[PDB]
Design a protein around this ligand. Structure first.
Ligand SMILES: [Cl-]
Length: 274
């Protein structure tokens, strides 16, 4: 196993595609779904199981996002969310599922406690966890959310939200990509790549994470985080290692880049960029 040079990349992909994606499938089937010997037992505890949309998609104990715990309430520290490294720093991202109705409060508690100023939503539209224009204030525990603005563009919608607790407050920008097809991957890579760049340009200049979500927090979320890595990488280097990147992402959250179509789409994006 080795990274692939930019000059060799198209030939590499052509070889993977031949004989009905024979080698693409072989390769993708080589990647285990999860890392052997990293526990995910916290996510399997009885008091946490209803906080997971899919019983087979769980964060690892070591890098799950831990909410402030109440010692008298088991599971008060739990959300199905994982820290994921970015290209320039560890813990740049949190990969999470879109909240379940019963974990909306937990989701906003995560936003508050991590001081996250940017959310990336890859679905439409799956529970709306932000206020409606006609009911623009919502309350979860001691956290209050106020919708401040909405900006609907062709391939995404931007929403600014105020979050407050005990009078302290923060503004959070939600970047909601709206151009992902109901089935399969985007036919055209350009809108998603533009969205990746837009999100990065909007980010807070502090060490706080960006929260990225999709239904399971692994498929579309994995593609988005992988593209944010790959787009930066190819500006600094003349080789690319999508296989190794996915193996690293899976070492931080099981099943990141969940299916062969998503894996192939990452290669198509690189082809389009070169
Ligand atoms: Cl979602």
């Amino acid at each position: 196993h080795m990274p692939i040079s930019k000059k060799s990349f198209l030939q590499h992909v052509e070889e993977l595609c031949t004989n009905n994606n024979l080698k693409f499938q072989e390769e993708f089937s080589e990647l285990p779904k999860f890392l052997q010997d990293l526990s995910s037992t916290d996510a399997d505890l009885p008091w946490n199981r209803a906080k997971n949309r899919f019983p087979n998609i769980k964060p690892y104990n070591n890098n799950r996002v831990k909410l402030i715990a109440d010692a008298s309430v088991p599971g008060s520290d739990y959300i199905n969310a994982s820290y994921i490294s970015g290209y320039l720093c560890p813990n740049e991202f949190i990969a999470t599922q879109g909240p379940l109705p019963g974990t909306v409060g937990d989701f906003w508690r995560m936003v508050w406690e991590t001081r996250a100023k940017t959310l990336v939503m890859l679905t439409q539209c799956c529970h709306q966890y932000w206020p409606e224009d006609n009911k623009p204030v919502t309350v979860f525990g001691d956290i209050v959310i106020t919708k401040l603005m909405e900006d609907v563009q062709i391939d995404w919608t931007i929403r600014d939200l105020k979050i407050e607790r005990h009078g302290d407050c923060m503004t959070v920008r939600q970047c909601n990509f709206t151009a992902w097809p109901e089935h399969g991957v985007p036919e055209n890579s350009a809108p998603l790549i533009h969205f990746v760049k837009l999100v990065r340009a909007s980010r807070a200049h502090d060490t706080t994470p960006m929260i990225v979500h999709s239904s399971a927090g692994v498929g579309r979320t994995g593609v988005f985080i992988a593209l944010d890595h790959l787009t930066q990488h190819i500006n600094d280097h003349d080789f690319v290692d999508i296989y190794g990147l996915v193996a690293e992402l899976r070492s931080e959250r099981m099943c990141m880049v969940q299916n062969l179509a998503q894996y192939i789409f990452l290669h198509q994006c690189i082809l389009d960029l070169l």
